[PDB]
Amino acid sequence: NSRDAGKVVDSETAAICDAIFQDEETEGVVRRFIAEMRQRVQADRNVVN
Amino acid sequence: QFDFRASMHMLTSNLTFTVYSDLLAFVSADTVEPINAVAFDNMRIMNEL
Amino acid sequence: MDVLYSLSKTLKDARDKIVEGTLYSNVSDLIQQFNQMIITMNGNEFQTGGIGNLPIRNWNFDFGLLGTTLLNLDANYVETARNTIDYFVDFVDNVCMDEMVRESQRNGIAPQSDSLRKLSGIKFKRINFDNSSEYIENWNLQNRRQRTGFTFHKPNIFPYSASFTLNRSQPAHDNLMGTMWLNAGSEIQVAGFDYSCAINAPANIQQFEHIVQLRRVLTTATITLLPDAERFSFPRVINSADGATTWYFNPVILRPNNVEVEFLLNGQIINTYQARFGTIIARNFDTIRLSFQLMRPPNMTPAVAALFPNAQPFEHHATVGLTLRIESAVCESVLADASKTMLANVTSVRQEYAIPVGPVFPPGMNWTDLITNYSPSREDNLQRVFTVASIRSMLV
Ligand SMILES: [Cl-]
Ligand SMILES: [Zn+2]
Ligand SMILES: [Zn+2]
């Protein structure tokens, strides 16, 4: 559901996020956040979030 | 109850690294000719020759 | 200037909007703008100079961008943002101070400090975003040669001047006719005095005129006109014109007669108010002409008749007055005024660091000297420093 090529850890998180995204009772804010939450990979710093 | 705000976290780690077990494999070790081997007193171990 | 203002506005928005618990959607565009500013400023070395006692300061920029990671912002995010914002605010304040303390005769509107000249480069134009403040909007419109104005409450448009003119005088200063006036800030208190109470006037009428040439054109001005000038309605001992001696003034206030307040632009009669007191509107003017008459009362009660004899000595001197207060106005040029703090800020910065007197502004940023000789070069420099001060005020 990411609109910016997002990634998540782990596959179980992906399943949970998809289930929440498809849910009808989910808040619009939560849905948009799932669509927009991003990882940050800093190879120069050797860090990943 | 499942709360998205309480369950969404950012997990941080290193992008990559290689773990080594045999440190001494990184050391090139050679030895002098046995004839020339000396003891703690800087004299040859066997001096009768 | 627009880049400096954009830095200041970005930092102010970051400080106000990046708060604990705020939704990610309340700062998304702000986070984008802040990251753009961080990217633009990263890897640049700035030097705020050492004019006067202002210390020489070196600024380096190596800051990480702000993530978009939590649905509601937490304390860690706010702490990181606060660290970056604090450093950037220090840099911006120092750049503003460095710019405020300089001036140029030829290019007074252009940047003077090295820091702002560097910020005027193309690479920094990316930092630019919404320019919504009054002073920055006026800066941009003026750069585009578009008509625009600053709105002032009690504009400081009249240089301080407390003086008099004696149209009739003697060495003994006992039968005097003339005018006194105080012009201070937005106030003009004028009075016309006749010691003889117009006993020998052509029609028992003495005509007094006060002309004030404003140094800049004021538009859409609201003015309060009051019949009497309370500053010149009590007995005074006044030094002679040359200071040789002193003379005595013992006013008795009479109603001003045939009052006419004329607001002139280009010598043309823009506005005219005849025997009208209270709130009046001057559309657009650069000169004020207050012409009023002292009329000897044709009918006097015995006490009043006792006040004014037919000949000398005159112990009671008939005075008429006028008070004019520009409560608010609009001017195409920057001015000091009661509400704003730009003159105070620039003067305080220049005093606190002992900036030597420059070639443009008067010593100590004396506002009376500045407005008295408000040259185009001084106007340009004053607009520059006032805009920088307004930029600084957003963060300091
Ligand atoms: Cl006021
Ligand atoms: Zn006020
Ligand atoms: Zn005199």
- Partners of residue C219 on adjacent β-strands: C284, C330
Within 10 angstroms of residue C151's Cβ, the number of other Cβ atoms is 14
CB–CB of C291/C194 below 8 Å?
A: no
Closest by CA position to C238, among listed C323, C176, C186, C194:
C176
Q: Give all strands (DSSP E) within C61-113, no chain letters.
A: none
CA distance C267 to C261: 14
Q: Which DSSP string corresponds to C142-195?
A: HHTT----EEEESEE-EEEEEEEEEEE--TT-SS-EEEEEEEEETEEEEEEEET
According to DSSP, the β-strands at C57-60 and C150-153 are: unpaired
Q: Which amino acid is at C141?
A: L
- Residue B26 at interface with chain C, using a CB cutoff of 8 Å: no
Q: Give alpha helix (H) positions in chain C.
A: 2-17, 28-41, 75-100, 114-119, 134-143, 302-307, 342-352, 367-372, 376-393
CA distance A31 to A24: 10
- Partners of residue C213 on adjacent β-strands: C287
Q: How was this structure determined?
A: cryo-EM
Binding residues of C for Zn(2+): 153
**CA separation (Å) from C234 to C182, C191, C319, C366?**
15, 12, 10, 30
Reported as type and span, the H/E element at residue C285 is strand C278-295
User: Which chains share 3+ C-beta pairs under 8 angstroms with B?
Assistant: A, C
Q: How far away is chain B from the Cα of A42, in angstroms, using its nearest Cα?
A: 8
- For residue C149, what are the contacts with CB-CB under 8 A and spacing of at least 6? C138, C219, C220, C330, C331, C332
State how far Cα C325 lies from the chain centre. Answer: 14
**CA separation (Å) from C305 to B29, C299, C317?**
129, 8, 13
Total count of residues recorded for chain A? 49
Contact C71 B5 (CB under 8 A): yes
- Partners of residue C321 on adjacent β-strands: C191
CA distance C281 to C9: 36
State how far Cα C338 lies from the chain centre. Answer: 7
Resolution (Å) of this entry: 2.9
Tokens of C298: 């044709």
CA distance B38 to A37: 68
CA distance C98 to C4: 12
- In b/e form, how buried is each residue of C13-47, taking b as 16+ CB within 10 angstroms? bbbebbeeebebeebeebbebbbbbbebbeeeebe
CA distance C366 to C346: 11
Tokens of A29: 């804010």
- Partners of residue C284 on adjacent β-strands: C219
Closest by CA position to C91, among listed C1, C11, C2:
C11
Q: Which residues of C touch B10 (CB under 8 A)?
A: 69-70
CB–CB of C109/C380 below 8 Å?
A: yes
CB–CB of A42/A48 below 8 Å?
A: yes
State how far Cα C23 lies from the chain centre. Answer: 42
According to DSSP, the β-strands at C158-168 and C177-185 are: antiparallel
